[PDB]
Amino acid sequence: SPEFMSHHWGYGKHNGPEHWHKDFPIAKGERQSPVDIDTHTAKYDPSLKPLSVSYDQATSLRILNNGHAFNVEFDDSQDKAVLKGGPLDGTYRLIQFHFHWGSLDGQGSEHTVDKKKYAAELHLVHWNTKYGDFGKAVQQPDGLAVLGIFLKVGSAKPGLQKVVDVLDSIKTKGKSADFTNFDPRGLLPESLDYWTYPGSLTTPPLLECVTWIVLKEPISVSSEQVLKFRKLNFNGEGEPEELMVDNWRPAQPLKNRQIKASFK
Numbered sequence: 001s002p003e004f005m006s007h008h009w010g011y012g013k014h015n016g017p018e019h020w021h022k023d024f025p026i027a028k029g030e031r032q033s034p035v036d037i038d039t040h041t042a043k044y045d046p047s048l049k050p051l052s053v054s055y056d057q058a059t060s061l062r063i064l065n066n067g068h069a070f071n072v073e074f075d076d077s078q079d080k081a082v083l084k085g086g087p088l089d090g091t092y093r094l095i096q097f098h099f100h101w102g103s104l105d106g107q108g109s110e111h112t113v114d115k116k117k118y119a120a121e122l123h124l125v126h127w128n129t130k131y132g133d134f135g136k137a138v139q140q141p142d143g144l145a146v147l148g149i150f151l152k153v154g155s156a157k158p159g160l161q162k163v164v165d166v167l168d169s170i171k172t173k174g175k176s177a178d179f180t181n182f183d184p185r186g187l188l189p190e191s192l193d194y195w196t197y198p199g200s201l202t203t204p205p206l207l208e209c210v211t212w213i214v215l216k217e218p219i220s221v222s223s224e225q226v227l228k229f230r231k232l233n234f235n236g237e238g239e240p241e242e243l244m245v246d247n248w249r250p251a252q253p254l255k256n257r258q259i260k261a262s263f264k
């Protein structure tokens with residue numbers, strides 16, 4: 001049971017975000033994520049470029065319940081699924097995506113917009129090819145680019161359904177399954193308008209390597225889709241059930257950072 005045999009970071013009362021600094025001191029660092037996006041402080045930057053999403057040749061491989069979310073993993077041994085343009089210099093390869101979500105529809109996102117919490121947030125994680133591999137990229141201030149997409153509850157997202165339907169097979173921590181031919185273009189909204197700022201990954205080890213690109217337009221998913229997320233488990237098989245919900249970190253201090261908008 002959580003925190004009895006040993007301690008591990010998580011999202012509970014004894015090991016949640018407010019505790020993470022005890023094992024990962026960078027949790028109190030100068031470029032932590034997520035942040036609140038104050039729409040009356042972020043300035044339009046006309047030097048930013050349109051975001052170039054080239055996911056046509058993506059190769060998904062597996063889906064994994066890692067005890068704090070599920071990752072959909074991709075073959076990143078070539079430039080098969082890349083993010084370019086905008087604030088980015090060069091080419092960033094997609095390695096995985098995952099979500100953060102709530103126990104109820106009024107919370108779940110990590111970023112907020114004028115303090116608004118969405119029901120969930122999708123993170124597509126990419127690494128800068130100039131550093132050769134993800135592990136070297138996460139030793140650099142421009143090593144990663146994360147495309148963040150808000151989810152609200154409304155109409156269903158057809159391109160999400162294949163994800164929803166596989167979750168029964170990865171209910172518990174450590175379970176993985178084959179998950180080929182998944183097209184992440186089915187998770188995008190219509191507009192690629194975005195905000196951008198320098199930050200970190202939002203789970204330990206909280207690495208301060210990320211250029212965040214947060215889309216303004218949410219995607220809609222149905223109540224039934226997000227309910228299926230909430231049937232996942234943080235625990236392993238044969239351990240008592242602890243539902244995988246509220247796996248989000250709250251907003252962190254902006255400090256001296258600037259949030260830029262791609263749109264006037």
Ligand SMILES: O=C1OC[C@@H]2CNCCN12
Pocket residue numbers: 038039040042043044261263264
């Ligand atoms: O994010 C927002 O929202 C309002 C303002 C418009 N100009 C771009 C930056 N802003």
Ligand SMILES: [Hg+2]
Pocket residue numbers: 066067068069
């Ligand atoms: Hg974990």
Ligand SMILES: [Hg+2]
Pocket residue numbers: 074075076077
């Ligand atoms: Hg890989």
Ligand SMILES: [Zn+2]
Pocket residue numbers: 098099100123202
């Ligand atoms: Zn994330």
